[PDB]
Amino acid sequence: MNDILTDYKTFYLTHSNIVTYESSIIDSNTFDPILYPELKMSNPKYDPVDWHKKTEWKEAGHIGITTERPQISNSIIECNSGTLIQKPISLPNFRNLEKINQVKINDLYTEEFLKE
RNA sequence: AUACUUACCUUAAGAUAUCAGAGGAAAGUCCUACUGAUCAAACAUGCGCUUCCAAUAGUAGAAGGACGUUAAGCA
């Protein structure tokens, strides 16, 4: 796939023009034949088109080892202090304090291979 | 702490209520647990003296602030 994208980039640049290119672009997909081969060079499942129940969040620092992290539900660290002074700050809401010591591991190598 | 060593200094004067009257050491000085009058201070003590001292029968209000927010307010 890396070969097909590199050779098609060299082929497209050498053999086509700006008219055909700007007609090839529609922003509903954000496909463009010069930049999209570069972005998807090594990502096979690349597509361009609540983020704490995702498994990217849950194993962020450590890959393979998934843990629910305690976090403050209403967190004010985006807010600047000049606007925080305007009205009184709510108490924190929380999430997942119970799970700071439980961490789970999907041990496929022990189960599928040693235990067969 | 003692002691020893050095280094730096070792000074503006004067006064303690006023005025008047009697006495003592002709002008003035000094003094009187002397005597009047005024003044000032302290301490007691009074004036039919003058001003001021916050809801609970209610969820307030008065005085003074903010080097507080709205706020890149509006012109």
Residue A2 three-state SS? helix
Give the distance, in angstroms, between residue A35 CA and nucleotide B5 C1'.
Answer: 91
Q: Give the method of determination.
A: cryo-EM
State the resolution, in angstroms: 3.2
Buried/exposed A18-47: b ≥16 CB within 10 Å, e otherwise: eeeeeeeeeeeeeebbeebbeebeeeeeee
Nearest Cα residue to A71 out of A63, A60, A83: A60
Q: Which residues does strand B reach (CB under 7 angstroms)?
A: A 82-83, 85-86
Nearest Cα residue to A58 out of A112, A5, A10, A99: A99
Q: Which nucleotides of B are covered by protein (CB under 7 A)?
A: 68-70, 72
